[PDB]
Neutral amino acid transporter B(0)
Amino acid sequence: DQVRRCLRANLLVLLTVVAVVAGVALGLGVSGAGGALALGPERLSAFVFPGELLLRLLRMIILPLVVCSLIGGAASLDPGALGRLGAWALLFFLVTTLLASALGVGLALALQPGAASAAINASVGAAGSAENAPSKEVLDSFLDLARNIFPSNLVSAAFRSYSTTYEERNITGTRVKVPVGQEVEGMNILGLVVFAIVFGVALRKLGPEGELLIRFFNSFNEATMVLVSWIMWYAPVGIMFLVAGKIVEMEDVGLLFARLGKYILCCLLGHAIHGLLVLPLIYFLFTRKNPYRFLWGIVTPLATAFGTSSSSATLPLMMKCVEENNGVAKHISRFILPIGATVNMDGAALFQCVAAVFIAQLSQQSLDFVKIITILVTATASSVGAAGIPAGGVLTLAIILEAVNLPVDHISLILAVDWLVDRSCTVLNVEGDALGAGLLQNYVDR
Amino acid sequence: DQVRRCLRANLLVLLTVVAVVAGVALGLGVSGAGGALALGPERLSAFVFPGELLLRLLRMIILPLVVCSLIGGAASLDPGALGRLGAWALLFFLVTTLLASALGVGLALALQPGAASAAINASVGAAGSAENAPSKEVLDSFLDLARNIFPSNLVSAAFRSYSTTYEERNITGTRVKVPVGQEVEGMNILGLVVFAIVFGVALRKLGPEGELLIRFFNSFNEATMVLVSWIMWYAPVGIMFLVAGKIVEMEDVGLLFARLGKYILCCLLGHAIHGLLVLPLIYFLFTRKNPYRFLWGIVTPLATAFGTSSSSATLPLMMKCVEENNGVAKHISRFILPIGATVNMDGAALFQCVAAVFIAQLSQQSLDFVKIITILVTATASSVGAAGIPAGGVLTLAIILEAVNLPVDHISLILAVDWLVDRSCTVLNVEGDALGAGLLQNYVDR
Amino acid sequence: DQVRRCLRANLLVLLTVVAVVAGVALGLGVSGAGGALALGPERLSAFVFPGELLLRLLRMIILPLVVCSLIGGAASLDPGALGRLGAWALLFFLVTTLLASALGVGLALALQPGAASAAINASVGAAGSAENAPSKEVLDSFLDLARNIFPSNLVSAAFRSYSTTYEERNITGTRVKVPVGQEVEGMNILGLVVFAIVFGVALRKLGPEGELLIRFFNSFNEATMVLVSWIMWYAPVGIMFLVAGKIVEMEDVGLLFARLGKYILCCLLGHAIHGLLVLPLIYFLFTRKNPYRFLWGIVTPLATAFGTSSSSATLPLMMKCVEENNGVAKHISRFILPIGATVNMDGAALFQCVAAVFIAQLSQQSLDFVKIITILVTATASSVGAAGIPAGGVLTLAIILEAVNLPVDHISLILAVDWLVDRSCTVLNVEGDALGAGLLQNYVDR
Ligand SMILES: *[C@@H]1O[C@H](CO)[C@@H](O)[C@H](O)[C@H]1NC(C)=O
Ligand SMILES: *[C@@H]1O[C@H](CO)[C@@H](O)[C@H](O)[C@H]1NC(C)=O
Ligand SMILES: *[C@@H]1O[C@H](CO)[C@@H](O)[C@H](O)[C@H]1NC(C)=O
């Protein structure tokens, strides 16, 4: 019939979502047959490997993609039009992140997740084990991000970022701390974006002298998009083992719900309202077109983000699916998506704002109005250079709580349920710019 | 006369082999005049340096050669012909390595190197000094190689590979070990081969759009082959100091022979039979042509392998000498030699199989038939990703002995005679693919 | 009037030198209002940051500049003319460094900086804190530099150099030390220069086959020079915070003068005589043209060197200002300046020679004539690969003093006044080759 007509023509849509429900089904099946203790750590890592091979194999594409697509992108058009394009671009992610994070305030205020339950049983959450975090100061973090932009060595910017630590070497008579930088390991995605855009304007500022080299990076981009076409077919195999691997690791019974499940129901709902009902309403108001036609065409990287739980490890999947399944130009789509991959971490900002209210709803705190705007503007500003580190939501939450001087006594309670909720973060994180990609397609016609 | 006619026209053949006998002559001359103690470690490293400068200066060529020649190679012809070419290729190294390693079994079985001699005086071999090796588990090693293929960061794949260690951090109540990866330093040659072939097909899959970039990497390959032409003339100077440097370092008297010299006579003979009598017989059976005409034309990298004692540090020397001194096409020779440099370590597999029989010939062990095929199939499979580390034959021998549960009580006896026998490994290691290069030249005519 | 005519047309000359006097004015103003203790280390690093952002942002340009300009430079002309050009080039920096360092001998001999003052009060200088330096041996340092030329991995040559340390692992019965190399972090500028020149000849040795790739690196150089045009305008903002940052850090009162100020008056005068009176006299003798017309046109990188206090972090500023403000050809100026940035550290050699006389003028030492030529030829030879490390003058002074066996008992006295005098080193260091750039412009006409 015609049911097999839409079956073959939408195979990637069908094969991906049948895999993510297979991972939950396989994951609960192994936990029902004993679990990780039934297998042991010998045969455990062999089970989680063929999914973990995908998350490794996909990250090697973004170094010859991000630094190569921006030069081919941001050299076709005029620099005055680019600053015209960049002004509407950078304004869009800022308004989205403020509106998403303020949604997390009132959703967590008018629900009270600090309920008389096992959530207020947080005496198990302290545990005296990993209390003394590094927890860098709030001035040094925003100082670090500006230093992380414009990297020191350009080859060093491909695998190691810049960070800062603290040394207690002042035993002069006053035991005070001093900062020192050591360049810990993790890919500096933000540092290479700001180079390639600045380098891309310089070819445009040259005349026909740089006509050879703009054709070079245009071609080098194009073969990579052929190479990522083959990666997409392995992605239904990998996500089946990402989800099923993670279920076996953590004890997902008794602590999933019935201990703090009011909080998980709160923060998933914040990801449910924003991006699925809020961002399509913004897209409908500017385009007067059906957003769910546009949203269905990019369903494969959204399920990939729920597999990988990484925002930057779905960027090549998104750049293909927006370009092919929906009508966008090449240069205008292969420009806004890399820069809009590491500046608009609003699903983090939705997560990071609620959890700070969550521990303040308990333990009797009084954030009436002055603390609300400080906890709003700091979360939308800290969520810029939060790309490389895996548990960035836990690490950058301490600098929120220090600047609004709330108790950080049990941050371990937000931890160990963040394999699930931050997995929903990257779904919403890569969803905003993709709608923002098609939003700029509207009035680029005029 | 005409003796000076063949002298000038075969200068590289004459000048190289007169240097390797000069290194043995110079090395025994310094050891006769006291030795390393007569010079002291101050003036010692100045003596070994101008050879060690060659082994450093040569390795910097293989990064813009391996990743550049494969793209220019594996993009001219069809992908269906490539998989046709790769199937005969990958089958050839597997049959060669099995036939070479099984030759080591019967040569070590029907000679009994565990003789009533100073070889069974292994009480000096234990010494209680470096017994507790890391000695990674046999599942984790083949898990590591698949993870070492498809590297994480492509810039990180140029100088640091991936490995795995063990941490004892499980003091939960059961003191068990856990694996963790840390990316130790050493060039990931295997990780870059599998990228450049996959990247090379992607240009072929593009039409005339990638016509610019295939001409780029074709040219970038060509200037490097001009640059390696100048390196070849320094090679008779360097090998004179590699050999003469190594003789002064180790005490080469009394322990060379007359302690375990039956073993060295056994394993050099295995390198003597295979590759000099076995591999020419295979080449004669498929080509009906004189193999020693072909074997004499590549005598300069074979003596370079006996100098450098490194398989991958003779690849640019081999790619020139096969292309010029013998009749092969450029694209078919500059493709099979990089991929056949890090997959066919059969001289290691000849070494690694005999030494496991050697310590089992002594200490009264009973490998009748079941242990023979396990010690055969594991040695031919572990010898794939053994490129970067210098003492790979000693390190990967422990994972052979664990999987066939033989005593590893004196592995230090195989050590400290491995400067000589593994120096004969790289001779046979780079000899197989060069014969395999001309073997594919036969029926590429049809 | 016409005073505003020369104001706008020489804005970079005016705006740069008004900033360096603003940094001394701002720096003494903050130290007068308490100082660093008045601010505290919290708000201290925020004050020194916008200057430190310049020194970071500028270093990322020299990797796609040094390795790219030399190939485009050293491939236009003939290799016989290049060796003709390189012979006059390498002779010029050697004669300059000998003449500059011998000027430091007689200026320090016939002034006696070891005066009966607080300089001979060096009992505060010992302090028993950091006496046990690594202080590598004099043979191993020149062995290290030759090994640092021709790097191991070409990607590894972009951010980590090679060095050597010492391990005490010989507890055989004689407690002696052994060298071992570990590749500490710092950009290998010298290792990439010697590759790109050798690689640049190889394109010239090819005919029209490499005509594509020489046009590639010619274009890739050109867009970088457009990119450094924008960096120059930020440089008056940065140098205002480099100088004012450094004044607040060190206690610049009482120890600046009146403790060892005879020495600082001696070594600044050596930088004052050479390069301002000696090198223009050499330039006048070969060109018969006004050197101060030529010297005024490059005043902006000279003040940048006094800001950054780094020789290699002014190379892109110098390559533009020589090319535009003065009449030189592009290929002959974008070749001699990178190779003449890391071979002619004569301002270091002026510094490093006087300080060794300085501690020998005190403590009653007898360098009559034999020690004078050894302290002269070693300082002009050690000052080759001294690029990457910040405090290279302190570190390489110990290998001078060991080879002329003077007491190293207070090397900390030369330290902590080296923020000022080595800041004058990089002024004279980048001044010699720029005069040498225009010196080769004279008889390139014939
Ligand atoms: C949790 O809180 C309830 C009351 O809300 C209390 O009865 C119970 O003992 C607490 N602890 C646990 C482990 O359930
Ligand atoms: C080595 O073995 C021989 C017997 O073959 C014996 O005579 C000799 O003492 C042994 N040497 C040592 C050091 O044990
Ligand atoms: C420094 O030297 C002067 C001599 O001019 C002497 O008066 C003073 O006591 C010395 N100070 C110290 C701390 O040695």
